[PDB]
Design a protein around this ligand. Structure first.
Ligand SMILES: Nc1nc2c(ncn2[C@@H]2O[C@H](COP(=O)(O)OP(=O)(O)NP(=O)(O)O)[C@@H](O)[C@H]2O)c(=O)[nH]1
Ligand SMILES: [Ca+2]
Ligand SMILES: [Ca+2]
Ligand SMILES: [Mg+2]
Ligand SMILES: [Mg+2]
Length: 166
């Protein structure tokens, strides 16, 4: 019936769960409960097509990342998330993309680079820097706030649109 399997990856605390929950459930999770591996499913219309989104929300914490690779293996597209006030999370993106390519055994995997927490003012990653990283990967860069919902739908729907280009 047209199902897209989306996987959200990135460092601990960047807002993977908050983004996914904002998308699927329309509220902001203020507290920080580290994730192991969670999944969500939602039927949505995207560009006139009724489809099923299966979204896997993965662990960013090393301690909780036990079998992440096995969950990533099934994904059709990946949201690579960093936080714009967390320079290390941005620098980590390289490692997530490499892990994705490893598990998919391919150098051509649909992805979108996401800079989250754009509502926050302690920015240490400038838009241009992230744009350049995404350009080097040949993927879109989109900024989001799980708190205000800005860009949230756009990031996930953009990933669906990347998968359709595959
Ligand atoms: N201001 C603001 N806070 C955010 C945003 N997204 C997430 N947060 C906050 O950041 C914290 C971590 O969010 P969370 O979604 O749990 O991060 P995670 O990437 O899923 N963590 P983990 O990898 O451990 O599962 C929470 O306190 C959450 O409210 C955002 O866009 N803006
Ligand atoms: Ca809340
Ligand atoms: Ca492999
Ligand atoms: Mg989480
Ligand atoms: Mg700088």
């Amino acid at each position: 019936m047209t199902e897209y399997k989306l996987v959200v990856v990135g460092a601990g605390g960047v807002g993977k769960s908050a983004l996914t929950i904002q998308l699927i459930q329309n509220h902001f999770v203020d507290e920080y409960d580290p994730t192991i591996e969670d999944s969500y499913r939602k039927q949505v219309v995207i560009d006139g097509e009724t489809c099923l989104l299966d979204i896997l929300d993965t662990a960013g914490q090393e301690e909780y990342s036990a079998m992440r690779d096995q969950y990533m293996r099934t994904g059709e597209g990946f949201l690579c998330v960093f936080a714009i006030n967390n320079t290390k999370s941005f620098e980590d993106i390289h490692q997530y993309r490499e892990q994705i390519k490893r598990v998919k055994d391919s150098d051509d995997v649909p992805m979108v680079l996401v800079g989250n927490k754009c509502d926050l003012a302690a920015r240490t990653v400038e838009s241009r820097q992230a744009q350049d990283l995404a350009r080097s990967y040949g993927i879109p860069y989109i900024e989001t706030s799980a708190k205000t919902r800005q860009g949230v739908e756009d990031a996930f729907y953009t990933l669906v649109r990347e998968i359709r280009q595959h």
